[PDB]
Amino acid sequence: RYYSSKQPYVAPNDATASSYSKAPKGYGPIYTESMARHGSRGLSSYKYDALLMRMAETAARDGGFKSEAIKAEFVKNLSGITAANVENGYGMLTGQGAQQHYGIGERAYQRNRSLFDQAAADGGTIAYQSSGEARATESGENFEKGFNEASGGRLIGNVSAPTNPADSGNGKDFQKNPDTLYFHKVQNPDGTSKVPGTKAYDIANNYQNFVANDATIAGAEKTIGDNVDVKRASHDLLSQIFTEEFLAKLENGEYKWYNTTDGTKKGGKNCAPGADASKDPDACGEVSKKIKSEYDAAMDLYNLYIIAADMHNENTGDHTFAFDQYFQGAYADDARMFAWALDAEDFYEKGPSYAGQNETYSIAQPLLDDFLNTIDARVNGGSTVATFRFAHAQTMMPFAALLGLPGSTQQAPASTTDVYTYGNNEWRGESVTPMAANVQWDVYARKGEDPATGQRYTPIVRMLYNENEVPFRSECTPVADGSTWYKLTELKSCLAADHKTLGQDARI
Ligand SMILES: [Zn+2]
Ligand SMILES: [Zn+2]
Ligand SMILES: [Zn+2]
Ligand SMILES: [Zn+2]
Ligand SMILES: [Zn+2]
Ligand SMILES: [Zn+2]
Ligand SMILES: [Zn+2]
Ligand SMILES: [Zn+2]
């Protein structure tokens, strides 16, 4: 199906959910924490559907459709996705995204039932955090509802009161934290901006200046944007809808559509039929966006295809859409090309990118720092037993590369021509950062002191990635052979830039 990073979240089956490894004897839960991307969402703005509608109107005028039925089908799919996004709101969570996080929060309580029941009895607290963006906060409140209905409401009174709540209403429980959940941009989702001179400002500012001005990234994206296999996929994909004469004139630069009311450059702001720009600002497109090639049209249609997978629940009633009919059979191979072009932009800008640099993923260091600092606060006598964070793909992708999670361990060649491809790299948007992708840490501890050292026993940590138990990077030594539990001291050592292990001292 090739949904790239619009892949809907696949929950663990009852076999996976009940086979998480048990901690070594004597250790019990003291803390858990998570970072999750927001769930499935609609279109970010009136763009892909708007531009293709302009192209469809031209092809209607010029007789460029292959048939009347094909054209009526094309127009009705476009009007359907646009109506669905207008009713749901552009850029907002869909019902599928709410269900994804509801289930994730349900299972989060079930996996640490002993910890949370004890916290309910003993005055422990739960911390909810968000980037500030509506999508992340709303995914959070659905997670929290699943958490509470799984626990029968016994933890509702145990929520830490934020000092900067996401909103006055249902997001009243969520602390805004753009320094660990939005570290990639100077401007924050809530309209504030990072403060010049602070480290969070420097991290976001340096990153944006790097990606904007790096020559290898731009050279590679230009190489992939002119790849002949992508161009042939574009033509064949559009060849099901438009006539070869229409496509020949588009490939010869005789056509061009801007995201305006008439398609021309001199048009004004284009807004989605039935939407209010004061309620729905994103329901109105940026006029600079255009379709100049077969590649643009094809990619816009592919984006409708993958977002339609996200809007499953909204696809009933009078205005339904069926974009998957354009990607059946051997056209699935064409979808593979478009998925690679989409993945490539993410790989080079937010993932491991090319070898010889760490600027694209070192921006995730504040979030890894907070992962370790909240553990430290808990072992040092704090009462927060859980921290649940909700952010974006722009948060998870560098975080996965920074830790070296499966799929984010291979950088592309330092070259503008020998570029990242599906043939030479494991990275895939659908597995690295699906919708509602999440990373969870469980932290256990053993009571008493460790005789022959004046100290308490080190806590141990186990990691779930999209609710799959995974080991840490290979440079890290686990507490025993074949184990996925790691001492906290070891992870402090091996997750730093040196990637050095503590050796025998990492073992229980
Ligand atoms: Zn809440
Ligand atoms: Zn609440
Ligand atoms: Zn660029
Ligand atoms: Zn093909
Ligand atoms: Zn062509
Ligand atoms: Zn053809
Ligand atoms: Zn309707
Ligand atoms: Zn780019």
PDB file of all heavy atoms in Angstrom, residues 148-161:
ATOM      1  N   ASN A 148      -7.557   6.315  31.702  1.00  0.00           N
ATOM      2  CA  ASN A 148      -8.456   6.381  32.849  1.00  0.00           C
ATOM      3  C   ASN A 148      -9.523   5.295  32.802  1.00  0.00           C
ATOM      4  O   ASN A 148      -9.869   4.721  33.840  1.00  0.00           O
ATOM      5  CB  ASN A 148      -9.089   7.769  32.932  1.00  0.00           C
ATOM      6  CG  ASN A 148      -8.084   8.834  33.331  1.00  0.00           C
ATOM      7  OD1 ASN A 148      -7.080   8.538  33.982  1.00  0.00           O
ATOM      8  ND2 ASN A 148      -8.348  10.079  32.952  1.00  0.00           N
ATOM      9  N   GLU A 149     -10.051   4.990  31.615  1.00  0.00           N
ATOM     10  CA  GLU A 149     -11.050   3.930  31.513  1.00  0.00           C
ATOM     11  C   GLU A 149     -10.433   2.550  31.711  1.00  0.00           C
ATOM     12  O   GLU A 149     -11.128   1.619  32.130  1.00  0.00           O
ATOM     13  CB  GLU A 149     -11.772   4.015  30.167  1.00  0.00           C
ATOM     14  CG  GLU A 149     -13.007   4.909  30.226  1.00  0.00           C
ATOM     15  CD  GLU A 149     -13.521   5.316  28.860  1.00  0.00           C
ATOM     16  OE1 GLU A 149     -13.898   4.426  28.070  1.00  0.00           O
ATOM     17  OE2 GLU A 149     -13.552   6.531  28.579  1.00  0.00           O
ATOM     18  N   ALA A 150      -9.140   2.390  31.420  1.00  0.00           N
ATOM     19  CA  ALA A 150      -8.488   1.122  31.721  1.00  0.00           C
ATOM     20  C   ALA A 150      -8.281   0.963  33.221  1.00  0.00           C
ATOM     21  O   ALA A 150      -8.343  -0.152  33.750  1.00  0.00           O
ATOM     22  CB  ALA A 150      -7.158   1.023  30.979  1.00  0.00           C
ATOM     23  N   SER A 151      -8.036   2.067  33.921  1.00  0.00           N
ATOM     24  CA  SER A 151      -7.767   2.049  35.352  1.00  0.00           C
ATOM     25  C   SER A 151      -9.011   2.323  36.190  1.00  0.00           C
ATOM     26  O   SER A 151      -8.907   2.440  37.413  1.00  0.00           O
ATOM     27  CB  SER A 151      -6.672   3.062  35.691  1.00  0.00           C
ATOM     28  OG  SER A 151      -6.999   4.345  35.192  1.00  0.00           O
ATOM     29  N   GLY A 152     -10.178   2.428  35.565  1.00  0.00           N
ATOM     30  CA  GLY A 152     -11.393   2.663  36.317  1.00  0.00           C
ATOM     31  C   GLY A 152     -11.476   4.002  37.015  1.00  0.00           C
ATOM     32  O   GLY A 152     -12.252   4.145  37.961  1.00  0.00           O
ATOM     33  N   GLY A 153     -10.696   4.990  36.580  1.00  0.00           N
ATOM     34  CA  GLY A 153     -10.753   6.315  37.159  1.00  0.00           C
ATOM     35  C   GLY A 153      -9.960   6.508  38.434  1.00  0.00           C
ATOM     36  O   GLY A 153      -9.956   7.621  38.976  1.00  0.00           O
ATOM     37  N   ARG A 154      -9.268   5.473  38.921  1.00  0.00           N
ATOM     38  CA  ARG A 154      -8.559   5.553  40.196  1.00  0.00           C
ATOM     39  C   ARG A 154      -7.317   6.439  40.157  1.00  0.00           C
ATOM     40  O   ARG A 154      -6.690   6.632  41.204  1.00  0.00           O
ATOM     41  CB  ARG A 154      -8.168   4.148  40.658  1.00  0.00           C
ATOM     42  CG  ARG A 154      -9.356   3.210  40.810  1.00  0.00           C
ATOM     43  CD  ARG A 154      -8.930   1.828  41.261  1.00  0.00           C
ATOM     44  NE  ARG A 154      -8.885   0.882  40.150  1.00  0.00           N
ATOM     45  CZ  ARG A 154      -7.768   0.520  39.526  1.00  0.00           C
ATOM     46  NH1 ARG A 154      -6.601   1.025  39.908  1.00  0.00           N
ATOM     47  NH2 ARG A 154      -7.818  -0.347  38.523  1.00  0.00           N
ATOM     48  N   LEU A 155      -6.933   6.971  38.998  1.00  0.00           N
ATOM     49  CA  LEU A 155      -5.770   7.845  38.901  1.00  0.00           C
ATOM     50  C   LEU A 155      -6.130   9.268  38.503  1.00  0.00           C
ATOM     51  O   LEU A 155      -5.228  10.098  38.357  1.00  0.00           O
ATOM     52  CB  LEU A 155      -4.751   7.282  37.900  1.00  0.00           C
ATOM     53  CG  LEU A 155      -3.781   6.184  38.354  1.00  0.00           C
ATOM     54  CD1 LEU A 155      -3.091   6.549  39.656  1.00  0.00           C
ATOM     55  CD2 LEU A 155      -4.496   4.847  38.477  1.00  0.00           C
ATOM     56  N   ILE A 156      -7.422   9.570  38.335  1.00  0.00           N
ATOM     57  CA  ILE A 156      -7.838  10.880  37.836  1.00  0.00           C
ATOM     58  C   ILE A 156      -7.352  11.990  38.759  1.00  0.00           C
ATOM     59  O   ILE A 156      -6.897  13.046  38.301  1.00  0.00           O
ATOM     60  CB  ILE A 156      -9.367  10.921  37.665  1.00  0.00           C
ATOM     61  CG1 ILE A 156      -9.808   9.960  36.560  1.00  0.00           C
ATOM     62  CG2 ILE A 156      -9.833  12.337  37.361  1.00  0.00           C
ATOM     63  CD1 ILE A 156     -11.291  10.050  36.224  1.00  0.00           C
ATOM     64  N   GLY A 157      -7.434  11.771  40.064  1.00  0.00           N
ATOM     65  CA  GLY A 157      -6.955  12.760  41.004  1.00  0.00           C
ATOM     66  C   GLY A 157      -5.457  12.840  41.163  1.00  0.00           C
ATOM     67  O   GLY A 157      -4.977  13.606  42.002  1.00  0.00           O
ATOM     68  N   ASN A 158      -4.689  12.081  40.379  1.00  0.00           N
ATOM     69  CA  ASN A 158      -3.244  12.007  40.552  1.00  0.00           C
ATOM     70  C   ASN A 158      -2.479  12.742  39.455  1.00  0.00           C
ATOM     71  O   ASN A 158      -1.288  12.491  39.268  1.00  0.00           O
ATOM     72  CB  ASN A 158      -2.796  10.545  40.614  1.00  0.00           C
ATOM     73  CG  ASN A 158      -3.226   9.850  41.896  1.00  0.00           C
ATOM     74  OD1 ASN A 158      -4.288   9.228  41.950  1.00  0.00           O
ATOM     75  ND2 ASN A 158      -2.399   9.952  42.936  1.00  0.00           N
ATOM     76  N   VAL A 159      -3.124  13.647  38.729  1.00  0.00           N
ATOM     77  CA  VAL A 159      -2.478  14.339  37.618  1.00  0.00           C
ATOM     78  C   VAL A 159      -1.772  15.585  38.140  1.00  0.00           C
ATOM     79  O   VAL A 159      -2.350  16.365  38.906  1.00  0.00           O
ATOM     80  CB  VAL A 159      -3.498  14.697  36.525  1.00  0.00           C
ATOM     81  CG1 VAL A 159      -2.790  15.253  35.298  1.00  0.00           C
ATOM     82  CG2 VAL A 159      -4.323  13.476  36.156  1.00  0.00           C
ATOM     83  N   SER A 160      -0.519  15.770  37.727  1.00  0.00           N
ATOM     84  CA  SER A 160       0.232  16.963  38.099  1.00  0.00           C
ATOM     85  C   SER A 160      -0.388  18.195  37.458  1.00  0.00           C
ATOM     86  O   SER A 160      -0.624  18.223  36.246  1.00  0.00           O
ATOM     87  CB  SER A 160       1.689  16.829  37.663  1.00  0.00           C
ATOM     88  OG  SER A 160       2.416  16.003  38.551  1.00  0.00           O
ATOM     89  N   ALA A 161      -0.652  19.210  38.265  1.00  0.00           N
ATOM     90  CA  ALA A 161      -1.213  20.445  37.728  1.00  0.00           C
ATOM     91  C   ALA A 161      -0.143  21.173  36.929  1.00  0.00           C
ATOM     92  O   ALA A 161       0.912  21.506  37.485  1.00  0.00           O
ATOM     93  CB  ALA A 161      -1.739  21.333  38.849  1.00  0.00           C
TER      94      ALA A 161
END
